[PDB]
Amino acid sequence: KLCLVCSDEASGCHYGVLTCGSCKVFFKRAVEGQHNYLCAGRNDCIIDKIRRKNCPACRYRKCLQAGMNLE
Amino acid sequence: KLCLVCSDEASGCHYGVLTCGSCKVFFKRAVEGQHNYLCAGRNDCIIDKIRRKNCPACRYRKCLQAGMNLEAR
DNA sequence: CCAGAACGGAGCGTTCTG
DNA sequence: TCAGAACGCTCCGTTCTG
Ligand SMILES: [Zn+2]
Ligand SMILES: [Zn+2]
Ligand SMILES: [Zn+2]
Ligand SMILES: [Zn+2]
């Protein structure tokens, strides 16, 4: 039902994890040509439908912790 | 010399406060439109040149705390 | 010197396709 | 089934104008 990264409504299983479409292509973009991501808080940001744009570092970390892989 | 919002190099006294150009146009954009920004941390994000884009909520709060206002004469 | 507009780049999220 | 391309919107920061 819900994206395992940002809790938005999931569209399917993308890169081995149940995610939404926005998290799908975010993860693809993050893995290619790393993007100089730095958290402004404590490496523990809240990632939800709105707040996910705030911290790509924490978003990317959550993607990996959920087990996203390009295969 | 240093922007009181993000500590980047200041470009002048803008909206009443010593700030850089980016914080100048950010504050103007924030006050004249919606500023319903949400912090994903604990409302104490580090705002500097590298991270000021991460949290508009905390950047706007630092603008207000430093005293920025549109009608600074 | 400063306010405001404008321009171009980056990041993001959707739609579309096979 | 889902991976990928591509378009357009938003946000940003520098340069330009008044
Ligand atoms: Zn998601
Ligand atoms: Zn974070
Ligand atoms: Zn600044
Ligand atoms: Zn914040």
Author numbering:
A (entry chain B): 419 to 489
B (entry chain A): 419 to 491
Please share text taken word for word from the publication where this structure appeared.
The GR is a ligand-regulated transcription factor (TF) that controls the expression of thousands of genes. To modulate transcription, GR binds directly to DNA at canonical GBSs composed of two pseudo-palindromic hexameric repeats separated by a 3-bp spacer (5′-AGAACAnnnTGTTCT-3′). GR binds a canonical GBS as a dimer oriented in a head-to-head fashion.
Next, we biochemically characterize the extant human GR (hereafter GR, unless labeled otherwise) DBD bound to an unmethylated CpG-containing GBS (pre-GBS) and its methylated counterpart (5mC-GBS) and find that GR has preference for the 5mCpG GBS over the pre-GBS. Binding to the 5mC-GBS and pre-GBS showed Kd values of 131 and 206 nM, respectively. To determine how GR recognizes the 5mC-GBS and pre-GBS, we solved crystal structures of the GR DBD–5mC-GBS and GR DBD–pre-GBS complexes at a resolution of 2.0 and 2.5 Å, respectively. Both complexes crystallized in the C 1 2 1 space group and each structure contains a dimer of DBD protein molecules in the asymmetric unit. Crystal structures of these complexes reveal a specific van der Waals interaction between Arg447 in GR DBD and the methyl moiety in 5mC-GBS sequences, which is absent in the GR DBD–pre-GBS complex structure. We found that in the 5mC-GBS structure, Arg447 makes side-on hydrophobic contacts with the methyl group of the 5mC, mimicking interactions with a thymine base seen in extant GBSs. This gain of a hydrophobic contact could explain the increase in affinity from the unmodified pre-GBS to methylated pre-GBS. Each GR DBD monomer contacts the methylated pre-GBS with one more van der Waals contact than with an unmethylated pre-GBS, which results in larger buried solvent accessible surface area (BASA) between GR DBD and nucleotides in each half-palindromic site (140 Å2 versus 109 Å2 and 125 Å2 versus 115 Å2). We show that GR utilizes a similar methyl–Arg–G triad, suggesting that evolution has leveraged a readily available side-on interaction with the Arg residue engaged in recognizing the G base edge in a CpG dinucleotide.
